[PDB]
Design an enzyme around this catalytic site. Sequence first.
Site, short mmCIF file in Angstrom:
data_model
loop_
_atom_site.label_atom_id
_atom_site.label_comp_id
_atom_site.label_asym_id
_atom_site.label_seq_id
_atom_site.Cartn_x
_atom_site.Cartn_y
_atom_site.Cartn_z
N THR A 199 -8.63 6.14 -2.50
CA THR A 199 -9.98 5.77 -2.66
C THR A 199 -10.82 7.03 -2.40
O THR A 199 -11.92 7.03 -2.84
CB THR A 199 -10.16 4.72 -1.57
OG1 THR A 199 -9.84 4.94 -0.48
CG2 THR A 199 -9.31 3.50 -2.13
N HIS A 254 0.72 -1.22 0.14
CA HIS A 254 -0.10 -0.02 -0.03
C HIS A 254 0.72 1.37 0.05
O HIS A 254 0.21 2.47 -0.20
CB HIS A 254 -0.98 -0.01 1.27
CG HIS A 254 -1.97 -1.06 1.09
ND1 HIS A 254 -3.08 -1.10 0.59
CD2 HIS A 254 -1.74 -2.42 1.61
CE1 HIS A 254 -3.69 -2.24 0.64
NE2 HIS A 254 -2.96 -2.89 1.42
N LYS A 277 -8.69 13.68 4.31
CA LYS A 277 -7.99 12.48 4.31
C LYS A 277 -7.05 12.57 5.35
O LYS A 277 -6.98 13.75 6.23
CB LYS A 277 -7.15 12.38 2.88
CG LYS A 277 -6.77 13.72 2.54
CD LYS A 277 -5.80 13.81 1.25
CE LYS A 277 -6.85 13.67 0.21
NZ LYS A 277 -6.66 12.43 -0.62
N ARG A 278 -6.29 11.74 5.93
CA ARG A 278 -5.46 11.82 7.09
C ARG A 278 -4.37 12.80 6.64
O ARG A 278 -3.90 13.00 5.68
CB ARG A 278 -4.83 10.61 7.39
CG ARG A 278 -5.80 9.56 8.00
CD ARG A 278 -6.19 9.78 9.26
NE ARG A 278 -5.02 9.81 10.53
CZ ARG A 278 -4.89 8.78 11.17
NH1 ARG A 278 -5.31 7.78 11.14
NH2 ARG A 278 -3.66 8.91 11.94
N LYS A 311 -14.60 8.04 -4.42
CA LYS A 311 -15.98 8.35 -3.64
C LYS A 311 -16.34 9.90 -4.14
O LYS A 311 -17.64 10.02 -4.28
CB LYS A 311 -15.57 8.58 -2.27
CG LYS A 311 -15.02 7.23 -1.55
CD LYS A 311 -14.90 7.49 -0.15
CE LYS A 311 -13.74 6.48 0.44
NZ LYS A 311 -13.37 6.96 1.82
N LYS A 365 0.39 14.28 1.47
CA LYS A 365 -0.61 14.58 0.97
C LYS A 365 -1.07 16.25 0.52
O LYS A 365 -1.77 16.32 -0.03
CB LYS A 365 -1.91 14.01 1.73
CG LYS A 365 -2.05 12.31 1.83
CD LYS A 365 -2.89 11.96 3.15
CE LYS A 365 -3.23 10.58 2.94
NZ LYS A 365 -3.70 9.80 2.02
O1 LIG Z 1 -3.75 3.59 4.73
C1 LIG Z 1 -2.68 3.29 4.24
N1 LIG Z 1 -1.79 3.14 5.33
C2 LIG Z 1 -2.27 3.33 6.62
O2 LIG Z 1 -3.48 3.41 7.25
C3 LIG Z 1 -1.01 2.85 7.84
C4 LIG Z 1 0.21 2.64 7.23
C5 LIG Z 1 1.28 2.45 8.33
C6 LIG Z 1 0.97 1.38 9.31
C7 LIG Z 1 -0.52 1.51 9.91
C8 LIG Z 1 -1.55 1.80 8.62
N2 LIG Z 1 -2.45 3.15 3.10
C9 LIG Z 1 -3.19 3.35 2.00
O3 LIG Z 1 -3.83 2.41 1.50
C10 LIG Z 1 -4.98 2.73 0.60
C11 LIG Z 1 -5.61 1.42 0.28
O4 LIG Z 1 -4.99 0.76 -0.76
C12 LIG Z 1 -4.05 3.65 -0.66
O5 LIG Z 1 -5.57 3.91 -1.43
C13 LIG Z 1 -3.48 4.73 -0.29
O6 LIG Z 1 -2.93 5.20 -1.51
C14 LIG Z 1 -2.40 4.28 1.00
O7 LIG Z 1 -1.95 5.44 1.47
C1 LIG Z 2 -12.17 6.86 2.01
C2 LIG Z 2 -11.55 7.45 3.28
C3 LIG Z 2 -10.15 7.42 3.36
C4 LIG Z 2 -9.14 7.32 2.27
O1 LIG Z 2 -9.30 8.86 1.43
P1 LIG Z 2 -7.78 9.19 0.80
O2 LIG Z 2 -8.12 10.56 0.17
O3 LIG Z 2 -7.61 7.96 -0.32
O4 LIG Z 2 -6.61 8.77 1.66
C5 LIG Z 2 -9.85 7.88 4.77
N1 LIG Z 2 -10.73 8.09 5.61
C6 LIG Z 2 -11.92 7.65 5.50
C7 LIG Z 2 -12.81 7.92 6.63
C8 LIG Z 2 -12.30 7.52 4.31
O5 LIG Z 2 -13.76 7.12 4.29
#
Ligand SMILES: O=C(NC(=O)C1CCCCC1)N[C@@H]1O[C@H](CO)[C@@H](O)[C@H](O)[C@H]1O
Ligand SMILES: *Cc1c(COP(=O)(O)O)cnc(C)c1O
Lengths: 810, 810
Positions: A650, A351, A542-543, A654, A548
């Site tokens: 993702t 990821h 997003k986080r 949305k 980002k």
């Molecule tokens: O969310 C991600 N990591 C985490 O939340 C942490 C990484 C470090 C360890 C804890 C989880 N990774 C995310 O995965 C998504 C699904 O494939 C992708 O769309 C995003 O591009 C990617 O950043």
């Molecule tokens: C879809 C979603 C994300 C992922 O968003 P990205 O912009 O792809 O990082 C993060 N948090 C919540 C609550 C979501 O629904």
Amino acid sequence: QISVRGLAGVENVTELKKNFNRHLHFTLVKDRNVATPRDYYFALAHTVRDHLVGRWIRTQQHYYEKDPKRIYYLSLEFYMGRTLQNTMVNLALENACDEATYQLGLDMEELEEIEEDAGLGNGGLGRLAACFLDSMATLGLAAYGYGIRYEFGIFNQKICGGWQMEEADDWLRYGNPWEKARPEFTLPVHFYGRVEHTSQGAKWVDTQVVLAMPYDTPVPGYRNNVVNTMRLWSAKAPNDFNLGYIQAVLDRNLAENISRVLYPNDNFFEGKELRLKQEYFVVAATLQDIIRRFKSSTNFDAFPDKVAIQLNDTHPSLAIPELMRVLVDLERLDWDKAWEVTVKTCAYTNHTVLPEALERWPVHLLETLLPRHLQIIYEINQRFLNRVAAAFPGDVDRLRRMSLVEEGAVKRINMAHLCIAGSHAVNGVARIHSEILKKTLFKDFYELEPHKFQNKTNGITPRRWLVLCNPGLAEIIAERIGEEYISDLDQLRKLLSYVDDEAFIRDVAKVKQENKLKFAAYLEREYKVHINPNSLFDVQVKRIHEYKRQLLNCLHVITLYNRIKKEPNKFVVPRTVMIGGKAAPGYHMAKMIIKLITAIGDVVNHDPVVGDRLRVIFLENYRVSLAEKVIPAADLSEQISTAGTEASGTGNMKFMLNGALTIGTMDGANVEMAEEAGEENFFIFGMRVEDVDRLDQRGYNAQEYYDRIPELRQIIEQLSSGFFSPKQPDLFKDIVNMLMHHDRFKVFADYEEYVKCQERVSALYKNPREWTRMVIRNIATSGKFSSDRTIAQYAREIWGVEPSRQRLPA
Amino acid sequence: QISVRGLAGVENVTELKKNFNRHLHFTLVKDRNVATPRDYYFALAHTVRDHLVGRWIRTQQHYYEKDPKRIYYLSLEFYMGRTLQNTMVNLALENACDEATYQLGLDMEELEEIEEDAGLGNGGLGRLAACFLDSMATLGLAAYGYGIRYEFGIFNQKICGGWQMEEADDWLRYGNPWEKARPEFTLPVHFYGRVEHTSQGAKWVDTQVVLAMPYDTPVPGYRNNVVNTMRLWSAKAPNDFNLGYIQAVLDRNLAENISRVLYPNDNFFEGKELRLKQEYFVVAATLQDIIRRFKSSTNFDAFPDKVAIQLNDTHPSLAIPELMRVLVDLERLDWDKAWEVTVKTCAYTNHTVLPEALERWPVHLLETLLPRHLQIIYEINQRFLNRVAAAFPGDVDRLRRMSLVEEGAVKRINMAHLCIAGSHAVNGVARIHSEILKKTLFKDFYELEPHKFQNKTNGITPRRWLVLCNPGLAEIIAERIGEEYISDLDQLRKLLSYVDDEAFIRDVAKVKQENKLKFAAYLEREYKVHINPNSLFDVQVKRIHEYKRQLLNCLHVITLYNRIKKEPNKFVVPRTVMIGGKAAPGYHMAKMIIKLITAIGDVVNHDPVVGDRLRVIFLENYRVSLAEKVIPAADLSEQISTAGTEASGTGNMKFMLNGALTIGTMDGANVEMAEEAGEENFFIFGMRVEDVDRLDQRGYNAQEYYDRIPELRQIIEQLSSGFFSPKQPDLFKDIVNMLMHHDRFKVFADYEEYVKCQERVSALYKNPREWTRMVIRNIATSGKFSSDRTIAQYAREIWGVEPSRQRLPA
Ligand SMILES: O=C(NC(=O)C1CCCCC1)N[C@@H]1O[C@H](CO)[C@@H](O)[C@H](O)[C@H]1O
Ligand SMILES: *Cc1c(COP(=O)(O)O)cnc(C)c1O
Ligand SMILES: O=C(NC(=O)C1CCCCC1)N[C@@H]1O[C@H](CO)[C@@H](O)[C@H](O)[C@H]1O
Ligand SMILES: *Cc1c(COP(=O)(O)O)cnc(C)c1O
């Protein structure tokens, strides 16, 4: 009220009403005189839950009789959100429950707001697992989600004085009507101890035991009567644990802390022992469960024909040596046969390419906690490196690069290398990301075993992310093309024949306006903030991470503010700029970015010259339930990561599905989104991956941009001088210093193109008809991004199973 | 099958069967193919629970409309046992459920064995609270039991190598179908902090907050449709608790440890901080609840007319200063008025005269944990001692004796003195005990306020302790005198007219034999131990304590063994001697006594010369459910405490009701039992209280008895030389040393009379008809010892309410 929400038949409404009253009386032990809105929510939840039960029992007995290949999705995160509306949607009960509750004098939408999110994830990775469960059930796969039942999910975010504060997410306080505890299926998990070598192989002895108690949650498919299971493990101490007396009972908490809390650190791999315990806990309990179910069908040759294990990132990577441990030490299989079985069973999904996120466990931790697993990892490494040496004779540096064991001050195990070695398939999550994996991070592994490497572009479920959150849009679409698109999203392409339809154009724009009005009212009622509903809703949710580039958005916001102050009587397209997301508690820079956003708001929102032409709002406590509210209201989706850093995204998908246009870099899934819709229907700007590489070779010098762009200089001078923090002038020095001297993500390099692109957005928004036509072109081509498509590809290309849209008997 | 178990009507059986099937499907999410016996238990429990709900809701709404005076029973212990059969008994559902389950192919008695005991007590005091709840509901009183929901109750006792081992009582593992969580009624409790003096009185500030979450359990009355509430508080951390991040969430356990475990130390007051926290926790949460309910009827003059608070021992004594705190600091009442209200509201029950059991809290603990309460206690003491000084001018030693504050190396607060000062009524629990209180321990207080001192002789509920545990006896009684005696136990006197009835004599003896056979089979099936069912069942079951003199029983057992070895071919009445009970984990001597009993068994049970003439069995894990099995099987009840030490006893009453004869000292309730039945129908032996006093004045010299009794000498020599521990000859040196040199309870002084009395028991047992006639005389006069009688007396003489046998509408 609306067609896609199902039928409200006289008999169903009558039956739902009496079962609601029954649960209120017998289950909740209340009567209408003392009952609160929360009691009413629970009565409805129990009523809807009853409708799942028959289907849940008969789905699982169906799998027992037919004995299909089972799919096991292993994840430390399942970001589920709320369950009530989703269950009603998938069971076609929404209109019936709406009518039933209405006749009882209750508003169902008000009751829905009472449910706590199941926030058992951080962001994208956790939410992907959740969409995947929905799609696997919809496609009739015999699939099980396995994870940890955290007592505390992702923290609730409070904003105090502009700063993020963390509060415990006590999501189980009022109970969880959806789960069923299964204490009868409790299994032991072993930790510590030592390895003993007997005449008949190795033995793992003198261990400490923690019990894993499963809780099962139903996962309904879309109107196919399939109900699959998500099984989450909870940690329990054995009754003889530490058995002066009082302290021994109190010390049970130490064992049970394993399942207490989700780690919220999503930026930087933290080699903490408790996290390793969590990872082994889920792996050990799950594999025992898998093997038990397999034996209840001696011969492990057929194991890979009946079992697929999908590893969501490296977090459950210990499945590989654990499976080897069970097969070799307990089942007495020879190494070579066990390894064949393991490789054919396991597959791994990556990821991110960011090095700081990669799990590299210190050998000394594994030595103490999991001594047998370390021995197995060493043997895996030795045999793997023997293959590399035979394939690339004399290439000594390749051997050190590919090793699962990393040398240095502290020896570490690279879990990604372990996953590649022990999996028959390795995938990235968007085309560009999968290509980057083969060209850079895992180049050596690709050269050795090219056949292992695949792409599986991410997707989102159109049930939660269209029908549930945006019924108005779902309905106007259904009016034109029917209801089949909900489980076959490619059918949205039929909407291209309506791009010049005057009625459809008006309806699409009407739905967006209604959504914007609803969200504007939500903000006033719940947070007491005033916004103009006629402004362009500019949204980045997003986080919070440097990659980002919420900071790039911040620079644009200040640019617009400065331009207004320079020419106050000049017309500009009004905007509401909304930024939301949580920061990892230990991520200082991300916490500073949140403070910056609120600080900008404090200046901009109270400047009389600006008026209602520009508003900057930080959306507090961003989570699944909030995403369901804000995404349908958005006009512009900000997807502005540095090219090559966002694996997929993702959230981007949305927004596309819900009628927002996208401003973005050619990063992650943005590339494929623009390919599907047409580049002319996307707002693409900035460096491509190749441009970033060229800048890295030359050396990135931020000073150059500061020197050449007067508007950028002004902003940096404002930040440094304390314009956005009058009482604390040096507050943002850390941000300025980073931007000027050590910015890994080249914020300044994309600034000029970003601002120019944003001008093109405002220009189009001035022409409502053409804005909406471009929106229609986006919605119509969003089909590829259904997680149904994604899961069908995993099924056919990795798991070796065929998806089915056939209904089970009701 | 039997009349007292109610009707099995066609419609009821049909309805129970369908609701059982409904719960198995919808509640448990199982079908008949995968369901285990535990699943079947839970389906039945939920079915029976449904029948409580309507009555529970309408009882509580009835109290709201009629607004009677409310009775609040505050206890740290509620020793409830199992709930399923008791609920069926009180609802008249036993025969119907028996038939319903039979028709489903299930054995209800087998399902009943699956339920875990609610072991939220140590022994007599905790079980008294439980019997009291049953009687208060049966007598139609608006009564509430308030306590703590311990996660872990009294430990499960395992015997390993003859030694007691402790295991955590994880009674909630499989869930509790009887309780209803009420998170909506959560209340804050304050700890630590400091006292601030403003212009308007004192303020308690800078406190730490722990939340008290209530769980409600229904308490059904006997066939009167009354269902009262037992509310137990559980400790919860606030969500901002300690809010690096991970550790703060993990540290929530510290707050929540308050309700984790029942203290099992029932011999020696342990001044531990966690115990004090438990005591304040229950008191603070309960009083807020009481006041809220009172206000939902400004004027606290009527408070004592609407509220009675009964303090079960000094454990909830902090209710007195807490009530003062609320009235003075929060409600702004003047001290004198607040004190009048407090005294008229509170009453205190004492359960022991042993000094080591009395709560004497170090001032330094109260100063840190509860600073405002300490100030209030000081003010109470000052005003109380001013009254003493005025009543007894110049009597300076009386002032130091009566003070709530005890001087010494560490200053302490005497909680018993606090209770007497702040209560309008103080009672002992049997006539002899109440007299001892006035003559010794509380003499000074009796002289000051004679009107405060009362007696309330203890009782047991004839529902659990006859109808439930001994249906065979209940039925043969009902055949003669009808069913009214179950709620009017005085009617058992009518059985005296059947003492010469040949049919009744045969039936009483038959029921006892059946019970003995059932228990003999229980021992083989569950513990693999062989006993002769034709032997005299000689039983001592109760917690292990020196004062209860299990050691005296041990000496008699060895005497019988030695006499057999001396004259092997001489006839003796065969006995099975059973001793059971738990020892406090930190009570070394009590643990040594358990080891002694098993050690005697190891020698006696394997001596071929003895044969089946003498067996010594230690009954493992004695608890409420085991008491229900063994008591109906007993022939002889051992109640052999040193005169003046057992306040009442309640086990004694259970045995009397179930057809055992009693060998006992004139101690506690034994005195009144012998008075009711006639001394000629009791086996009374040993020193009276006055004889113990005479021996104390002269000085107790154990050597004298050793020198004069050859049979006693032999036993001590056997113990010392290692006859009962060949591989560890000095194992019992601690026991011998105590008996010879520092025996507080004068075991040797009662030995000769005890042995002689035991010979008279064996003589009567040789004549089955006369044994049974004496049994009939005991059962017939057991009426006084119903807790219905006890509660009626509390109601009329302390609480100022009238009991009602009138039914509520069904
Ligand atoms: O969310 C991600 N990591 C985490 O939340 C942490 C990484 C470090 C360890 C804890 C989880 N990774 C995310 O995965 C998504 C699904 O494939 C992708 O769309 C995003 O591009 C990617 O950043
Ligand atoms: C879809 C979603 C994300 C992922 O968003 P990205 O912009 O792809 O990082 C993060 N948090 C919540 C609550 C979501 O629904
Ligand atoms: O059980 C008792 N204390 C305890 O369990 C402990 C005392 C020390 C603190 C912890 C409880 N006390 C018992 O109360 C019974 C009911 O009145 C009486 O019948 C008994 O005579 C008495 O010993
Ligand atoms: C009745 C009872 C007691 C009290 O017995 P005494 O002999 O009066 O101490 C203790 N434990 C249990 C389980 C009881 O049922």
